[PDB]
Amino acid sequence: MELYLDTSDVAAVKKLARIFPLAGVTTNPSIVAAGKTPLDELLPALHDALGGKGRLFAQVMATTAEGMVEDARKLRAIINDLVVKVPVTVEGLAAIKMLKAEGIPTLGTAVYGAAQGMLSALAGAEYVAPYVNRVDAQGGDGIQTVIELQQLLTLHAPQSKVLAASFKTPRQALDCLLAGCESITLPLDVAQQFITSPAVDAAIVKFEQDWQGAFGRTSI
Amino acid sequence: MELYLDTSDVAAVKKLARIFPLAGVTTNPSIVAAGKTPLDELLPALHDALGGKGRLFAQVMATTAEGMVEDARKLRAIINDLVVKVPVTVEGLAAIKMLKAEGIPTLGTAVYGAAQGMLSALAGAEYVAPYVNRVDAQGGDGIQTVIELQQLLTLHAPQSKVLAASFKTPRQALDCLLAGCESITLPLDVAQQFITSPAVDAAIVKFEQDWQGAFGRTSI
Amino acid sequence: MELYLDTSDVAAVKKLARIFPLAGVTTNPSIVAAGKTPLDELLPALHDALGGKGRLFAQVMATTAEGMVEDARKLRAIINDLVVKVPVTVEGLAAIKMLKAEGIPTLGTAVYGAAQGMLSALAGAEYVAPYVNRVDAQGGDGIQTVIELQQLLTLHAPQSKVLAASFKTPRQALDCLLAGCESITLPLDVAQQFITSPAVDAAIVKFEQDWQGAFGRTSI
Amino acid sequence: MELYLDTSDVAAVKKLARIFPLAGVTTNPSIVAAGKTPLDELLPALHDALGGKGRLFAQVMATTAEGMVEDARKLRAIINDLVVKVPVTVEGLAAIKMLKAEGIPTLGTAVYGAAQGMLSALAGAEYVAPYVNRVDAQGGDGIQTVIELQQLLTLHAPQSKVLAASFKTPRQALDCLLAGCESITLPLDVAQQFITSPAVDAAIVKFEQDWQGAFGRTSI
Amino acid sequence: MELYLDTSDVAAVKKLARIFPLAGVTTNPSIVAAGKTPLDELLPALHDALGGKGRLFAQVMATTAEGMVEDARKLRAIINDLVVKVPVTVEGLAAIKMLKAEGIPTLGTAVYGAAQGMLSALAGAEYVAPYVNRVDAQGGDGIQTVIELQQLLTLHAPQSKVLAASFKTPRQALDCLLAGCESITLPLDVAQQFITSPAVDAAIVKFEQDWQGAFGRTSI
Amino acid sequence: MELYLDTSDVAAVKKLARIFPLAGVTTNPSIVAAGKTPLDELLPALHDALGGKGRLFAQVMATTAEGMVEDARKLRAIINDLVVKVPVTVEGLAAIKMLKAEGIPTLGTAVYGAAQGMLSALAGAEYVAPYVNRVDAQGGDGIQTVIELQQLLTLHAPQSKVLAASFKTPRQALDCLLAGCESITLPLDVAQQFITSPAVDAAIVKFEQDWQGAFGRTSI
Amino acid sequence: MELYLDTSDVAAVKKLARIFPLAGVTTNPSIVAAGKTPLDELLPALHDALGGKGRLFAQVMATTAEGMVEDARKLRAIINDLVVKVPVTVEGLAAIKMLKAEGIPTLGTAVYGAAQGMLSALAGAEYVAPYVNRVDAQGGDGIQTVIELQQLLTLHAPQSKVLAASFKTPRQALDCLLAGCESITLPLDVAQQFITSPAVDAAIVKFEQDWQGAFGRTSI
Amino acid sequence: MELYLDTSDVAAVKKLARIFPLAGVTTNPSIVAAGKTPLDELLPALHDALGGKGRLFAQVMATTAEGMVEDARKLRAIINDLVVKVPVTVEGLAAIKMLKAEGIPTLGTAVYGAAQGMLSALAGAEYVAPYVNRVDAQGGDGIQTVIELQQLLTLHAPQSKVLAASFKTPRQALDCLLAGCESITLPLDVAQQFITSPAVDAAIVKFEQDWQGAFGRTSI
Amino acid sequence: MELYLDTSDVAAVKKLARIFPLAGVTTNPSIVAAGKTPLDELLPALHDALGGKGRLFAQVMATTAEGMVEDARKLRAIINDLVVKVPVTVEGLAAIKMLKAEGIPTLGTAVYGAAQGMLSALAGAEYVAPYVNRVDAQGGDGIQTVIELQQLLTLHAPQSKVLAASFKTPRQALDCLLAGCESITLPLDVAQQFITSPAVDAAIVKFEQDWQGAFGRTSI
Secondary structure (H helix, E strand, O other): OEEEEEOOOHHHHHHHHOOOOOOEEEOOHHHHHHHOOOHHHHHHHHHHHOOOOOEEEEEOOOOOHHHHHHHHHHHHHHOOOEEEEEEOOHHHHHHHHHHHHHOOOEEEEEEOOHHHHHHHHHHOOOEEEEEHHHHHHOOOOHHHHHHHHHHHHHHHOOOOEEEEEOOOOHHHHHHHHHOOOOEEEEOHHHHHHHOOOHHHHHHHHHHHHHHHHHHOOOOO | OEEEEEOOOHHHHHHHHOOOOEEEEEOOHHHHHHHOOOHHHHHHHHHHHOOOOOEEEEEOOOOOHHHHHHHHHHHHHHOOOOEEEEEOOHHHHHHHHHHHHHOOOEEEEEEOOHHHHHHHHHHOOOEEEEEHHHHHHOOOOHHHHHHHHHHHHHHHOOOOEEEEEOOOOHHHHHHHHHOOOOEEEEOHHHHHHHOOOHHHHHHHHHHHHHHHHHHOOOOO | OEEEEEOOOHHHHHHHHOOOOOOEEEOOHHHHHHHOOOHHHHHHHHHHHOOOOOEEEEEOOOOOHHHHHHHHHHHHHHOOOEEEEEEOOHHHHHHHHHHHHHOOOEEEEEEOOHHHHHHHHHHOOOEEEEEHHHHHHOOOOHHHHHHHHHHHHHHHOOOOEEEEEOOOOHHHHHHHHHOOOOEEEEOHHHHHHHOOOHHHHHHHHHHHHHHHHHHOOOOO | OEEEEEOOOHHHHHHHHOOOOEEEEEOOHHHHHHHOOOHHHHHHHHHHHOOOOOEEEEEOOOOOHHHHHHHHHHHHHHOOOOEEEEEOOHHHHHHHHHHHHHOOOEEEEEEOOHHHHHHHHHHOOOEEEEEHHHHHHOOOOHHHHHHHHHHHHHHHOOOOEEEEEOOOOHHHHHHHHHOOOOEEEEOHHHHHHHOOOHHHHHHHHHHHHHHHHHHOOOOO | OEEEEEOOOHHHHHHHHOOOOOOEEEOOHHHHHHHOOOHHHHHHHHHHHOOOOOEEEEEOOOOOHHHHHHHHHHHHHHOOOEEEEEEOOHHHHHHHHHHHHHOOOEEEEEEOOHHHHHHHHHHOOOEEEEEHHHHHHOOOOHHHHHHHHHHHHHHHOOOOEEEEEOOOOHHHHHHHHHOOOOEEEEOHHHHHHHOOOHHHHHHHHHHHHHHHHHHOOOOO | OEEEEEOOOHHHHHHHHOOOOOOEEEOOHHHHHHHOOOHHHHHHHHHHHOOOOOEEEEEOOOOOHHHHHHHHHHHHHHOOOEEEEEEOOHHHHHHHHHHHHHOOOEEEEEEOOHHHHHHHHHHOOOEEEEEHHHHHHOOOOHHHHHHHHHHHHHHHOOOOEEEEEOOOOHHHHHHHHHOOOOEEEEOHHHHHHHOOOHHHHHHHHHHHHHHHHHHOOOOO | OEEEEEOOOHHHHHHHHOOOOOOEEEOOHHHHHHHOOOHHHHHHHHHHHOOOOOEEEEEOOOOOHHHHHHHHHHHHHHOOOEEEEEEOOHHHHHHHHHHHHHOOOEEEEEEOOHHHHHHHHHHOOOEEEEEHHHHHHOOOOHHHHHHHHHHHHHHHOOOOEEEEEOOOOHHHHHHHHHOOOOEEEEOHHHHHHHOOOHHHHHHHHHHHHHHHHHHOOOOO | OEEEEEOOOHHHHHHHHOOOOOOEEEOOHHHHHHHOOOHHHHHHHHHHHOOOOOEEEEEOOOOOHHHHHHHHHHHHHHOOOEEEEEEOOHHHHHHHHHHHHHOOOEEEEEEOOHHHHHHHHHHOOOEEEEEHHHHHHOOOOHHHHHHHHHHHHHHHOOOOEEEEEOOOOHHHHHHHHHOOOOEEEEOHHHHHHHOOOHHHHHHHHHHHHHHHHHHOOOOO | OEEEEEOOOHHHHHHHHOOOOOOEEEOOHHHHHHHOOOHHHHHHHHHHHOOOOOEEEEEOOOOOHHHHHHHHHHHHHHOOOEEEEEEOOHHHHHHHHHHHHHOOOEEEEEEOOHHHHHHHHHHOOOEEEEEHHHHHHOOOOHHHHHHHHHHHHHHHOOOOEEEEEOOOOHHHHHHHHHOOOOEEEEOHHHHHHHOOOHHHHHHHHHHHHHHHHHHOOOOO
16 A cells, blocks of 8 residues: 655655655645645655655646646656656546656546546556545545546556545545555545544543553553 | 547547557448448558557458358458457358358457357457447347346356447446456547546646646646 | 427427327527527427427526526516526526525526535425436436435425436436436437337337238238 | 236137136237137137136237227227227327327337336326347346336336236246236246146145045045 | 144144134144044134134145035035135136135145245135245245245235245244244244243343342242 | 534625525534634524524533533523534433423534434434534544434434534535435535536536527527 | 257257357257157267267166166267266266266256255266256246356366256346356257347348448448 | 265165265264164264265263363274364363364364354364254354354364254255355255255156157157 | 453463463453553463463553653563554554564554554554444444454555454454454453353253263263
8 A cells, every 4th residue: 555645745744754654745736836835846855754765746737748748757857756647638648648658657637537547547647546525526426436446447457556535534535445546645634633533542541540540650 | 458449530540549548440330331431441541540550340241151251351351450340140150150260350249138249259259349329229228238248258258358339428338347348449429528527627727726826837 | 207308309399299298398508509599489389399288498598696587587478388497506596596486487407416406406496407418428427416316305305306307328318217207308319219129110020920921911 | 916818819718717817818919810810709709718808908000100099999899998009119109199088098018128118108008018028038138127117107107007928937927026017918838837836736646645544535 | 913833733732822822723634634633523623722712724635626615615614713725726726716706715825936826816815825845845945935925915915915834944934924924834843942942041040040149039 | 404504604604595595504612613703692693694584503511411401591592593402411411301391492412423313312302413524534434323323313213303514525415415314504615515516617608608609699 | 168059950950050159969858759860860960960079968768877877878879979967866866976987977957956956066967957947937946046056066066067958038048147157058949039139130231221321332 | 065964874874875975974962862873883884884985973972171082082993084073162172172282183063153163163173063953943043153154264264164064954954055165964854855856756757758759668 | 363362360361271272362451450460470470371372462551652662662571472552543653663663563452443443554563453342332333443444454454464352242253253353352251152152051961861861871
């Protein structure tokens, strides 16, 4: 399993990198924009925050296949372990094919349907990123879309992975993991919710009280 | 997965060949008739449009097995590596057996039922093409027919593939791919609908807006 | 059950009114445009084609609730038995509420999700029209959307009906009827596919041959 | 439940009328042709064979709606209370509407699909007859068609009944009855198989043997 | 619910009549033979064993419908609350119809299939008795047969009841009751197994021990 | 259906009251705090924003039952149509009983499990509010919790309603509505997402373009 | 997959051997009798009709195990590639064991239950032939029996194959193939129904018309 | 598959050993008692009845582990291929561990629940024998118990087999075999029922009559 | 499978170690407290009670990652084959990573949700212990949490095992084992319930009696 954070918050990555077993960080244009730091600075900072390891993802902005290939080269020049995110559009599919021929790894992003996602894998994308919450938000069934996508890759493009993205609640991310997605990228709030629990905290308090009751101390 | 277009539109094939990872082009008599170009012109033009590679399919017209074998030879003389489509009828089954012995690859076409389709595979067809929408349109269940056919081939003729055909909506094609079909042929309209999305377009607009807001341009 | 045709083709309505038990005709802005005939001419012509009876639907064009109410009154002034189609948007929902207060019947249209649909019913729409094929075409599950919508209306707004729309194959329409939709509108092509079948034609030919064999005529 | 025989064999009807609780007899053109007896003789002979009661069904032969209406009149003159079978075609639907207005009961016959069958009920048919075995024989799913049709009638035309027809095995007829069909018509062979059983015969032999062993006779 | 014992053991009936809420006793020719007491003696003895109440069942032995009607009259003359068991055969169905006309209540017995059973209800039988264990014993699915039969009566003959019979294990009888059978007849061994339990006995022993431990007595 | 907003944002309620068919507004202590307006001002302001109608909900703050009853009376006096939210704790249940006897309507809030929810209804609560997203966020299954709660109320307290609350995505709210919840309260973000759609927006654009094409204007 | 015909009709075998990929022909005592030709003439004639190849099956007639072994040797002396059908009875199972020891291949026939079938496989039969339609006809569920039998062989005797037999409709045979039977024997009527379809015929007519329309001939 | 008889009836074993492919015979204390022959005579007699081969099972009688080990050694010395049945109790589990360490094969018997059964396998038992009918008879679900036991062994102790025991009807035994049990022991009555059938008998009669009809004899 | 006891009751462990095939003993702070014996004395006593073998588990008490590492080393210093239980919190996950690097085996404890559990495995924990009954007791679904966890480990962290913990009834433990947990820890009461049964006791009593009746003794 590859666990990613979906963020441009370098300090938060550093903090969480000692907690979670992170595979790296994913970005998208909005996430990059929120942090107000250009990629030529952000990407090496994230690399450092991870402990000088991990895989980064960053997205092309161009609207032609040729322009997207140019963007991909620029991104790959910034840092070594970098997968290029390409929106799965007409021009984006064409770009994914060209990038396959050139040996630049890609992720098919902005996926709102299973067939669209499968096409990006067949075209050469190593990862396919459905926008789970966006599908939920717009009156669809994001988890069903993930289940279908994962089925398509398993059947038809088994070397490609689902990288599930776009979460507002832990349950969405859990459901993606149960569907078999081999990679996932979490926003910071959902990531933290996985490891915050009133039930767990209460269990620990009770253990401490019992221990103190028996031994007159809270330590071994 | 082998992804085909179901078309005689040479210019459309050239355009989409740089977008999709195409395995080739399928034709049938109505499709060839629509484009008004005879096979001896059309098939080389398709081969060219694909980039001088790919797998073409064309259908016999004769009604006797011996006639169908003669047609198969004529078609193979036009395209030496073409796969010959044979309707799965009494004489069509007889022809498929003869063509197996002769070493000419076949597809069993005009399949409206699973058992009919299985029989064509057992006779030697490398592909079996159910007419999904035609079964749907005539008050049956095209997807159920495909599921059954796929089950039969998996159980009883695993060297043969389903090449699902006849589509009016992306959902039909998606369902066939979910059912495990190892090949599919799409009409131009359905193919384009897979990679056309208001939701995807809006996501990209938003990414551009957010990028511009931060950095004053929509280029990397 | 209310069976509608989804068309501006007056002659085809007259032809099919004899065959189907039609409740009326639905239109939308594209359908009206395709027919080239403005509503003040079209709607009376449809009324006549139906045999001077039936229910007609036509859609507002304005983008503000006030403007939509003005359109509704205009539309109602053309034709007595007219239900006004209102797009289920922010301003559309506002208009549906106002039209309920005024006692003008409405249909909530351009529905791509069940919750959106249900909201239009709660706001006062007598009908809710999911765009089945458009949901299918954009990588969703139009039939699942219809099942959900119908469930919501049955549970929460049982005085409102689904009027299923947007079809490319009989199977979609069949699946909507099986889901319990109490009204449906068919394009001409799908409507005619319901009632023309090679299997049925062949059965009737066989009957005629057997009758001729025994009695030496094909008539009673 | 209304149980019919599907036959032109007058002597067989008389025999089975004392065994089964028959509601009447259905015919179709092939069945009438098989017995070589014209309708004006056959239908009164059937009515007699049933005990001068019961409901008879016979099919029109004309191909225009007006012709079918004329046939219906002719059939009703032979048997005043007969139910007229009309193939569910374009002209057949038109005829069913006309016959509804005239007050002549109809059955919509030659139904190979659920939606086709539903349309006949909505047009006025009191019964709808799917051809179960014919759908089975042609690579479909007859029982699934019946289940769908029954669902449609229950939802959308509950005053109309399914009269399931066309059987090669008791299992098909059983499945139709389990599906909720409120009427059925059996060929003689299937009907007799329901009430013929090696297991039942052996049970009775054993009862007789046991009785004789104790009491020295096989009479009460 | 009507709970019957399937026996000719008068003393056992008396014993169990104060334990179970019995509706009566069923017999068949083998059961009668085992007890070596003719019906003219057995039936009044059973009536007495029940406490001078309850419903009895006894089976005809004749092989013609006319003979079965004669037997039925003889049986009804023996005792008032008597339902006549008729094997569901060709002649048995004919007899059931005649007995309906004459107002003598019947049960359709020796039922090994759902359709056969349903026919006996339609013919007039108030009860239908499938031979559950016999169907199981001969490589069928007795419980499935009961489920199907109960479905047929519920749908098609709701005034008739299933009287489930022929048991070797409580689980069979339980499964019949869960399927909705409104009457059942138990052999003595299975009846007793329902109310014999090592777990129950152990629970009671433990209650007694606890009580003695607290109060020094085993009584209130 | 009763549709609430879950907010203290008076201006936002005023805006959305003309869009949605609101039953009223729910508050909780955090939501009230975020607005920084005390209830004795907020509740009349919300009443007015709704159009001087609707039902408001507010939560007690005391931790003893007697304290909670005092809170209840105080809240009721601020505005007529006011249902008192009581946390389903030990003291909360005691307070709900007391409030039933006084005839003050209550809602049992802070529900994280079905049995807890049911108990509040049995004690007299008219509504029970599961915290769907909170259950999801802490590693449980919020929707399953709602399904079970709804089942318990339908079986055991059918006079009580589920008022589903706590949402981060439209899909959660939809799933609650599908589960049968007869009331729901939405945060502003989720409410707005129900009626925001790129697909709907694009549909309306296309209509406008088609209309303009035919008629030379975008109005009727 | 092994596809057999179940027939004694030599000319029909020769005709169909050209069309189907036949593994051989099965016979039973009734089939042989119907053809009027004794086995010592029939079996060589079938061999020739198949093209001097294929596997033949014929059934013993004796009622003792010793007699069945004598029949098997006689049958094997007629034809080299011959599998001896043995009824799965007490003496049949004894014979199957003896024939295994002698190295004569067997098929366990007249199977009406899964356990009975499995026993024949365990005793040494290479094939087990359930009588699908006979189970259906006598009020059972022949397909359920086949599913169970196939499960038993897969689990407990995987070297043995189901050879599904006894068919009145294509659907039964289809369902057996879907259940995973690795061999099947078809009567002539059902075999031919698989490969003749009004829908298929109509498709090929349309192709021919469209081709003629464009190219002014119906040939390539 | 290992097929056992559950009996002490030597003559019956001799008879059935030539019919069924037996793996051997199981005994228990009650079955041994019923035969009134001590094990030191019975076990060699059974060995001979099987043909001087096969695997025998016999149960310890001691109630301490040490006692049970002594019983085990004694049983093993009577006959080579002997598996020792040990009741899965507190002392039985202890004995099973000890017998594993000594290399004496065991079966864990008197199993009435899946977890109990699993524990015996983990302790070293090669077989685990659930008492299917006893669980059924005491108001539980024997087949479900077997399904769960089989699941536990497959997951957690795959070297161990279920040896399903305790049967009153063929259906119980069939259901165990369908659940995957790799061994089974049948009482004589149930064993015989597997291979007794009125339907099979009637099939063979009909064959004989048809053969006689054509050929003037009942032999080949 | 690894079977543990969840206890600090040294004498009970010694007693049960000869009955069950134990892998060792688990403790937690409450269980240790309950025994009133410090770890430095308890853990060697438990080692001895197991027979000087097996694996022990004990929990850290510190709240920082650095403190938890210090505790881990302290615990390893007491007992050789000891796995350190670490609560799956923020600091716990950090500690699990550190302990993985150092090669000290860990178990991720206090797991109330599947994703939380999976994270601990990904961080390096060899075992993950969901608190089954604690989840059940707080209104969740402990078994569903275990099913989800086991799926997550199987898919995403197959080297890690579920060690199911926290039981009030055998059914919970059984359900965890059915879910495929590869290790489990039982409290004493549940462990003993698995292997004590009135039904089993009664069976053995009846065996003894039958044996007595035949052989005039209860022993082999």
